[PDB]
Amino acid sequence: DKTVLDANLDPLKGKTIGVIGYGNQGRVQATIMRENGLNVIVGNVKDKYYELAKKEGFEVYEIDEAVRRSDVALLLIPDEVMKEVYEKKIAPVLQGKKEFVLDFASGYNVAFGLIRPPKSVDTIMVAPRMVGEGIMDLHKQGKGYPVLLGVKQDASGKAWDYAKAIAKGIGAIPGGIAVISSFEEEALLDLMSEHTWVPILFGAIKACYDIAVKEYGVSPEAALLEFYASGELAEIARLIAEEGIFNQMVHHSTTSQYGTLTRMFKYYDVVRRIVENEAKYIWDGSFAKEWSLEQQAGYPVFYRLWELATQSEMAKAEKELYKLLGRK
Amino acid sequence: DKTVLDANLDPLKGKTIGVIGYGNQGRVQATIMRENGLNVIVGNVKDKYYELAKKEGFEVYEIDEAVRRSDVALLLIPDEVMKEVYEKKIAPVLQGKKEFVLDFASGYNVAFGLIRPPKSVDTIMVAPRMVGEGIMDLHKQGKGYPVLLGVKQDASGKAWDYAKAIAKGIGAIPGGIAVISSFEEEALLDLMSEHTWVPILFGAIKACYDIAVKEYGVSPEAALLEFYASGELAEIARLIAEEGIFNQMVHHSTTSQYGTLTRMFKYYDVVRRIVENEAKYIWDGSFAKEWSLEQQAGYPVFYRLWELATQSEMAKAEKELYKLLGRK
Amino acid sequence: DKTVLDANLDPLKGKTIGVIGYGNQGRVQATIMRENGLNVIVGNVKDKYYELAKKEGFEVYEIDEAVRRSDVALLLIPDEVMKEVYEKKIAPVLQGKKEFVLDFASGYNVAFGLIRPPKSVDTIMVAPRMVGEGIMDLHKQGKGYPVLLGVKQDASGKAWDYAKAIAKGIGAIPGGIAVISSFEEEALLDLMSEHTWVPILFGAIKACYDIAVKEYGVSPEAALLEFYASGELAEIARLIAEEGIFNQMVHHSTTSQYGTLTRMFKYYDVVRRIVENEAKYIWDGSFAKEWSLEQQAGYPVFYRLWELATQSEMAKAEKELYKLLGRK
Amino acid sequence: DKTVLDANLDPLKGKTIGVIGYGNQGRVQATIMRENGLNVIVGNVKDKYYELAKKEGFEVYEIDEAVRRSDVALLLIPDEVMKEVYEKKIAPVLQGKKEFVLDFASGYNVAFGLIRPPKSVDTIMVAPRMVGEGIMDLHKQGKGYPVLLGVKQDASGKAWDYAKAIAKGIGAIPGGIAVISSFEEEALLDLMSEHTWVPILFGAIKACYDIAVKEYGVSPEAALLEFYASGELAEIARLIAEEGIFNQMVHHSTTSQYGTLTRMFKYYDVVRRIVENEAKYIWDGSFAKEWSLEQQAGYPVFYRLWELATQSEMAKAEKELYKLLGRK
Ligand SMILES: [Mg+2]
Ligand SMILES: [Mg+2]
Ligand SMILES: [Mg+2]
Ligand SMILES: [Mg+2]
Ligand SMILES: [Mg+2]
Ligand SMILES: [Mg+2]
Ligand SMILES: [Mg+2]
Ligand SMILES: [Mg+2]
């Protein structure tokens, strides 16, 4: 298979590594690889995070100054402001560099060409598949966790080895796994979830509520308990994560099993259509354009939709209810 | 008719002419009108082209400094960066001008309002219909060549005479012809080709290849020889340029003639529909918006499509083949 | 792969070869294989071509008399009159033959069953992919060129070896290549081009002209210069043949690239449909019937369409223009 | 206008004229131009018509022998067997001719390319618009009648003058008129009537009968009297020919006028569609192919449809009725 379970750690030994950004991923991975025996500096703009970063024992300079001292840089910052940070501060210093390894956690800005590093650089990806908080919950146990790897540009014949070395340094392998993939195959996946089954789920729940209340005379206080105000969803999700998606359904009643299976096979093509459309929209580079242009215009649609959703009937009722259950 | 075969050359005699840009068109036309007895300066930003330009005997200043010394300016630079060059460097000096003639080779930026010169200026067009390289191949022979002319703004009652004078200076007439037209009628035409029959041709060839290989069991090495890897296309194009489009078909077999004619009349309306749609899209100013916005967003779609086309099956096979024929 | 680069020449040495027909292919290949050390006779009906053929040093008899002296025959005559020539003159003599190799340049009449030679014969194909004139332009340079090969009927266990021997004799390999294929895979390809992208191209150009003139007020003298009366087409075709189809587009402006790519991917399915339909029409044997029946009826449709095309508006305008440019 | 009322008669004086065929048109026109002072020979194959032809005082030879003695030939024979008569007998002699005028009454075989005379010949048309019988009914009165004229090929600069001379010789002008037109504009018209309004009329009558009998309980003996077994139709046709198409309706009742006008404007587009389709079918040369192929196959469809029509219910009833009225 394409699965890597463990690999060597030598190429990073002797070099210095700069961790750009000290958010969730930055903090965690920085700490872990400081623990695995590697000299690390941190680069950040001076605010709260800078205080905490220098508190935890890391020597900190400005971003560009950190890029100069480093043979490897990890850009662990949001994808929404990385472009400007790169053009302003990193790209010049980088033109003033020799043999550089550039690692990312997301492939959005590179897959779609918004960041185009030079040829003297090894361009790689090491993408976790976690919230970021739970990686420490799993690290103290000595457990690994999964990651995706990719190489966009190789000028050293060793980029894959550097990728695996990083994968080990961050503490994902051994114990977890590491899949080799592309920048594209990562952005595509990350976006497909956000565009296909999450919103469909939310809309279906909303529609169930609306229909039940406005057509069958149900009370708002009752529909919410059944549809999402109860913790049935998280339970089912846990059983999925642990026992398996279909095997999870054994613990339910046969009536439920039958209805679920029948209707799953009944409405399958309908959603496959949607998924096809959205995946095609992404692969072509259209959504990136949409999103960049909305940023430039001032986020009007974003604003209006946030207002509509929060000022909906279901949300008002949920507010009253949570106010009543005591849940904050 | 509207066709002009030769005209006077006096209005440009006594004046100075500045040639902004020294690319293909710039170099050629600059040289020609230096040869036809006119004092010429060149304006360019300092790089390789500046070296060659001063080498060939032209006195060169910066752009703005050239606009100051000139009563006429020819903006022979790409349409993709002319807007900024105009707003930064030319428009101020031009506000500090008196009686100025402004000539373009393309009407894209003026037809759609991206460049709006003042009223003290004569705004004209002189548009060649060549690659640019072959104009010298035709000049040494004393041959002319065709051009289009247009006037957008007249403040001197002599703009057409200036246009014809330029047409002669560049060496298009006499021997060739000069059609009088609009900025709009030039942009429209230039874009219609790029949007209607070129891409349709390419897609049809691609589809022929795909179908033949994936449905009738043909080898990739064979389909390419028939469809485009042979030089039949260029031959047919030459016969079209010389003998005529339909008369060209005499040299082929009657079987070919019959099939071609029948299927040409069969599928005519289908493509007429497409051409209508695209021409309407252009006339309204929508494509200009599309293209400007893609520039502002960072060329994501451009990037992705360039990748898809080059990483297609046909392209890989063509690479192997050309590698085999010895053709580079 | 299936590609053959060079092979032996022995099986043809000791045998005699008759070249039926002395047109373009006949003349060229006859001369070449006379030069490569093979005894050759020529068979033709007595007219101008017979004079030239006996002039160039070939001994000539009537067709049947040439088939009698020959162990191999090359039928290099039009596909439109080969059927009668075969039934009248060749098939009888051939019934009076022993061990015969029959080679064709086109597979139309054999693929569709219009010519069905007996079992005592080796039926083969050697199909050039050139105009015929340029093969000499490439021969004096020692350059090869590509061909397709096929075997329809083998009664000697050596038909493929004979095919490769012929391929070498005609001077295609070495230096070029030789693909092994079928009679069907040759007729199909030759006809698909004549039915799919050539007529689509012509109709699209015609539609562009008609629309521009009758809906946007453009002059006829101007549309023609842009669409086909200029030599841009042949240039693009040459760059395709040499540099590659997509790589060719680097030399153009980014505006052109963007529009072309977008519209190519936009209108792809539309033409794929057409190509599917026409390829299916061919594979089934329907077009052969259509064409044979039109021959029998007297070419009325052919006639009328030739009239309509030549008496069209675009053609009249093109006549006036070419009359004006000086181009004949 | 394009209308010719009378013209000169000199070019035919001194020449000899051969009238190929002695049917209706042949007999009539031959006689008339013998009366107008012109030497005439007749060419026909030897049967009944030959007897009558030599009876009426014309010297008769075989076809080819008549073409040899003649400077002008009129091919007044059916369009269904003219092709073979031309290829066998006329075309050879004609290759052995010098300065020849070839006249036709119909343009079917020339418009669609089934007969292609050489360049040494003046190819003309003189097309009557009569049954042929009534031309004598109009000649004794000194009345002219209308004809159409056309020129397909001119090699003498006098073809139109020859056409008008013929028009006068046949006795159409003066008194009638002569319109100048094309071979195409004659075949098109002659066929459009046979394909559009004649069959539509017949089918509408048939449908009226069928509906009335099988859905409203009318007797067959009654429907026929109303729809066509009475002479109302011929009366209306005469009033049309004489008074005018719309003015004809004054003699009818206002109820009839109102219904007719309303329904005429109501169903106009429906039939315009049909007429468009059929005219396009003709202009392209498709019907000629259809008809030629049915001839070659043996007239199966013709046969079957003749059977179906005659063995229909309406026809049986009409037979009984006519048997009853005494009308034969
Ligand atoms: Mg995400
Ligand atoms: Mg995700
Ligand atoms: Mg362009
Ligand atoms: Mg162009
Ligand atoms: Mg062909
Ligand atoms: Mg071909
Ligand atoms: Mg008729
Ligand atoms: Mg009629």
**With contact defined as beta carbons under 8 Å apart, do C135 and C28 qualify?**
yes
- Measured distance CA(D203)–CA(B208) in Å, rounded: 47
- CA-nearest residue of chain B to A285? B301
Residues 6+ apart with CB under 8 A from A25: A76, A105, A128, A132
Q: Which residues pair with B137 in a beta bridge?
A: none
Query: Which residue's structure tokens are 């050039």?
Result: C128
- Alpha helices per DSSP H over A142-267: 159-169, 184-195, 197-216, 220-227, 232-243, 254-266
Say how many CB pairs under 8 Å bridge A and B.
Answer: 38
SS3 D85: helix
Q: Which residue of C has its CA nearest to D296?
A: C297
Angle, alpha carbons B41-B43-B48 (nearest 5°): 115
| CA separation for the pair A147, A164 (Å, rounded) | 10
Q: CB within 8 A of D52, min separation 6: which ones?
A: D22, D27
- Ramachandran sector of residue B300 (left: φ over 0; alpha: ψ -120 to 50; beta: rest): alpha
- Rounded CA-CA distance B117/D250 in Å is 71
CA of A190 to the centre of ligand 2 (A): 4
Q: Where are the strands (E) in D9-120, listed by range?
A: 17-20, 40-43, 60-61, 72-75, 100-104
Residue partners of B206: CB distance under 8 A and separation at least 6:
B312, B314, C268
Query: What sign has the CA pseudo-torsion D81, D82, D85, D88?
Result: negative
Q: Is residue C97 a contact partner of residue C73, using CB atoms and an 8 Å limit?
A: no
- Domain stop point among C146, C181, C216: C181
- Strands of chain A (E only): list them: 3-4, 17-20, 40-43, 60-61, 72-75, 100-104, 121-128, 147-153, 178-180
Q: Which of C293, C296, C304 sits opposite D285 (nearest CB)?
A: C304
Residue whose token pair is 């293909």: B24
Residue C26 burial (CB count, 10 A): 23
Range of the domain at A132: 1-181
- β-bridge mates for residue B125, sequence order: B104, B150
How far is C294 from C80, CA to CA, in rounded Å? 12
Task: With beta carbons less than 8 A apart as the criterion, state whether C125 and C167 touch.
Answer: no
Taking CA atoms, A147 is separated from A2, A71, B79, C313, in Å, by 13, 22, 45, 66
Answer for the pair A21, A47: CB distance below 8 angstroms, yes or no: no
Give the DSSP H/E element, type plus range, for residue D39: none
Note whether A268 and A172 are same-domain residues.
no
Bridge partners of B236, per DSSP, are none
Are the beta carbons of A273 and B278 closer than 8 angstroms? no
Contact A13, A40 (CB under 8 A): no
The CATH code of the domain that includes A38 is 3.40.50.720
Secondary structure of residue C174 in the 3-state scheme: coil
Total domains in the fold of chain D: 2
C269 and C175 share one domain: no
In what order do the strands lie in the sheet containing C3-4? C3-4, C178-180, C147-153, C121-128, C100-104, C72-75, C17-20, C40-43, C60-61
Tokens at A198, concatenated: 């999450």
Question: Which residue, C74, C110, C113, C109, is CA-closest to C90?
Answer: C74
Does residue C223 share a domain with residue C208? yes
Query: Chain centroid to CA C145: how far?
Result: 14
**Residue D39 CA to its chain's centroid (Å):** 26
Query: Are residues B197 and C195, on separate chains, in Cβ contact within 8 Å?
Result: no
Chains contacting C with at least 3 CB pairs below 8 Å? B, D
Domain boundary residue, one of A127, A152, A181: A181
Residue D100: both structure tokens together: 């020849």
CA distance D154 to C63: 41
* 3-class state of residue C13 by DSSP: strand
Please give the distance, rounded to the nearest whole angstrom, from the Cα atom of residue D142 to the centre of ligand 8.
24
- Resolution, angstroms, 1 dp: 2.3
Tokens of D67: 């073409």
Q: Is the peptide bond before C174 cis (omega within 30 degrees of 0)?
A: yes
Give CA–CA dist D103/D74, Å, rounded.
5
Q: Where are the alpha helices (DSSP H) in chain C?
A: 24-35, 48-55, 63-69, 82-85, 91-95, 108-111, 134-139, 159-169, 184-195, 197-216, 220-227, 232-243, 254-266, 268-283, 286-297, 300-310, 313-325
Handedness of CA B64, B70, B72, B75 (dihedral sign): negative
Cα gap C151→C171, rounded to integer Å: 20
Residue A300's alpha-carbon distances to A78, A189, A290, A297, in angstroms, are 21, 27, 13, 7
* B220-227 vs B313-325: helix crossing angle, rounded to 10: 80
**A307 Cα distance to chain centroid:** 25
Instruction: Give the torsion through C-alpha atoms of B162, B164, B167, B169, to 10 deg.
Output: -60
In terms of domains, do B10 and B146 share one?
A: yes
For A237, the 3-state DSSP assignment is: helix
My answer on whether B204 and B228 are in the same domain is: yes
Helix (H, G, I), strand (E, B) or coil at A42: strand
d(C-alpha B210, C-alpha B224), whole Å: 11
Can you tell me which residue has the tokens 């690319």? B23
Instruction: Select from D112, D292, D293 the Cβ nearest to the Cβ of C303.
Output: D112
Shortest Cα distance from C92 to chain B (angstroms)? 28
Residue A51: which of A64, A60, A39, A62 has the closest Cα? A60
Residue among C293, C294, C298 whose CB faces D114 most closely: C298
Separation in Å, CA B181 to CA B132, B152, B278, C270, D135: 21, 10, 21, 34, 59
- Experimentally, the structure was elucidated by cryo-EM
Q: How far apart are CA A179 and CA A170, in angstroms?
A: 15
DSSP class of residue A17? Answer: E
Q: How far apart are CA A274 and CA A289, in angstroms?
A: 20
Which residue has tokens 């209306």?
A: D236
Q: From CA C61, how far away is CA C39, in angstroms rounded?
A: 15
Nearest to A122 by CA among A146, A150, A92: A150
What's the Rg (C-alpha) of chain B?
A: 23
| Ramachandran sector of residue A268 (left: φ over 0; alpha: ψ -120 to 50; beta: rest) | alpha
Q: Which residues contact D286 (CB under 8 A, 6 or more apart)?
A: C301
Could you tell me if A185 and A151 are in contact, meaning their C-beta atoms sit under 8 angstroms apart?
no
The number of residues making up chain A comes to: 328
Residue A53 CB-half CA count within 13 A: 27
Please return the burial class of C24, using the count of CB atoms within 10 Å of its CB with bins 0-12, 13-18 and 19+.
middle
* Three-class DSSP labels, chain B: CCEECCCCCCCCECECEEEECCCHHHHHHHHHHHHCCCCEEEECCCCHHHHHHHHCCCCEECHHHHHHHCCEEEECCCCCCHHHHHHHHHHHHHHCCCCEEEEECCCHHHHCCCCCCCCCEEEEEEEECCCCCHHHHHHCCCCCCCEEEEEEECCCCCHHHHHHHHHHHCCCCCCCCEEECCCHHHHHHHHHHHHCHHHHHHHHHHHHHHHHHHHHCCCHHHHHHHHCCCCHHHHHHHHHHHHCCCHHHHHCCHHHHHHHHHHHHHCHHHHHHHHHHHHHHHHCCHHHHHHHHHHHHCCHHHHHHHHHHHCCHHHHHHHHHHHHHCCC
Does B253 contact C318 at a Cβ distance shorter than 8 Å?
no
Query: Are the beta carbons of A164 and A124 closer than 8 angstroms?
Result: no
Q: C262: nearest CA in chain B? A: B305
Give the contacts of A178 (CB within 8 A, at least 6 positions apart). Answer: A3, A4, A5, A7, A146, A147, A148, A149, A164, A167, A172
Tokens representing residue B311 in the block: 């990483």
What are D's interface residues with C at a Cβ cutoff of 8 A?
83, 112-114, 283-286, 288-289, 292-293, 296
Site of tokens 């590179």: A110
Q: Is the peptide bond before D174 cis (omega within 30 degrees of 0)?
A: yes
Q: Which contiguous run of DSSP H or E holds residue C182? A: none
- Contact status, residue C220 vs residue B282, Cβ threshold 8 Å: no
- CA-wise closest residue to A21 among A56, A68, A60, A72: A60
- H helices, E strands: number in chain D: 17, 9
Burial (CB count <10 Å: 0-12, 13-18, 19+), residue C231: middle
CA of C256 to the centre of ligand 4 (A): 9
Alpha carbon distance D187, D213 (integer Å): 39
Give me the sign of the Cα torsion angle D12, D16, D20, D26: positive
- Please, which residues have CB within 8 angstroms of residue A73's CB and are 6 or more apart in sequence? A17, A18, A19, A20, A43, A66, A67, A90, A100, A101, A102, A103
Cβ pair D73, D102 in contact under 8 A: yes
CA of D18 relative to ligand 8 center, distance in Å: 26
CA-wise closest residue to D286 among C307, C301, C292, B262 = C301
Residue A173 is inside which H or E element, if any?
none
Tokens representing residue A322 in the block: 């949570």
Chains in contact with chain A (at least 3 beta-carbon pairs closer than 8 A): B
Cis ω for the linkage preceding A118 (within 30 of 0): no
List chain A gaps (C–N > 2.5 A) by preceding residue. none
Taking any CB pair shorter than 8 Å as contact, residues of chain B touching chain A are 293-294, 296-305
Tell me: do B164 and B37 sit in the same domain: yes
First-to-last alpha carbon distance for chain D, in angstroms, is 47
CA dist., res. C297 & res. D287, Å (int): 11
| Chain B residues close to C215, C-beta within 8 Å | 276, 279
Q: CA A305 to CA C97: how far, in whole Å?
A: 87
Question: Are residues A298 and A193 both part of a single domain?
Answer: yes
b/e A81-95 (16+ beta carbons within 10 angstroms → b): ebeebbeebbbebbe
Q: Rounded to whole angstroms, how far apart are CA atoms D136 and C225? A: 60
DSSP string across D143-184: ----EEEEEEE-SSS-HHHHHHHHHHHTT-TTTS-EEE--SH
Apex CA A59: angle with CA A54 and CA A61, to 5°?
95
* Cα D204 from chain centre: 24
**B298: which chain A residues are within 8 Å (Cβ-Cβ)?**
112-114, 288, 292
On whether the CB atoms of residues C200 and B269 are closer than 8 A, the answer is no
Positive or negative, the CA dihedral D237, D242, D248, D252 is negative
D3, amino acid identity = T
Beta carbons of B126 and B163 less than 8 angstroms apart:
yes
With vertex at residue D300, the alpha carbon angle to CA D296 and CA D305, rounded to the nearest 5 degrees, is: 135
Neighbour tally for D107: CB within 10 Å: 25
Assess contact for B160 and B234: CB atoms under 8 A: no
Q: Which residues of A250-274 are buried (b: 16+ CB within 10 A; e: fewer)?
A: eeeeeeeeeeeeeeeeeeeeeeeee
Q: Are residues C116 and C189 in the same domain?
A: no
Feature table: binding site of D for Mg(2+):
190, 194
Instruction: Give CA–CA dist C80/A283, Å, rounded.
Output: 50
Cα(A210)–Cα(A232) distance, integer angstroms: 20
Whether residue B190 is annotated as binding a ligand: the answer is yes
Residue where the block lists tokens 């330029």? B166
Q: List Cβ neighbours of B142 (8 Å cut-off, separation of 6 or more).
A: B175
Nearest to C275 by CA among B246, B228, B216, B313: B216
Indicate if D163 and D125 belong to the same structural domain: yes
Containing C172, the helix (H) or strand (E) segment is none
- CB B57: neighbour CB atoms within 10 A? 9
Are C85 and C63 a contacting pair, CB within 8 Å? yes
d(CA A76, CA A29): 9
Within 8 A by CB and 6+ apart from A209, the residues are A220, A223, A224, A227, A314
The last residue of a domain, from among C162, C181, C200:
C181
Chain B's closest residue to C190, CA to CA, is B226
Beta strand pairing call for C147-153 and C121-128: antiparallel
Sheet holding B17-20, edge to edge: B3-4, B178-180, B147-153, B121-128, B100-104, B72-75, B17-20, B40-43, B60-61
Angle separating helix axes C220-227 and C197-216, nearest 10 degrees: 150
Identify whether residues C177 and C261 lie together within a single domain: no
- D6 and D130 in a single domain? The answer is yes
Distances (CA, A) of A6 to A28, A104, C37: 20, 20, 67
* Main-chain dihedrals φ then ψ at residue D321, nearest 5 degrees: -65, -60
The two structure tokens encoding residue A323: 């106010």
Distance CA A115, CA B298 (A): 9
Torsion of CA C176, C182, C183, C188, to 10 degrees: -90
Residue A241 has phi, psi (to 5 degrees) of -60, -30
D40 Cβ partners below 8 Å, 6+ apart? Answer: D16, D17, D18, D19, D30, D33, D34, D58
**Whether residue C111 sits in one domain with residue C195:** no
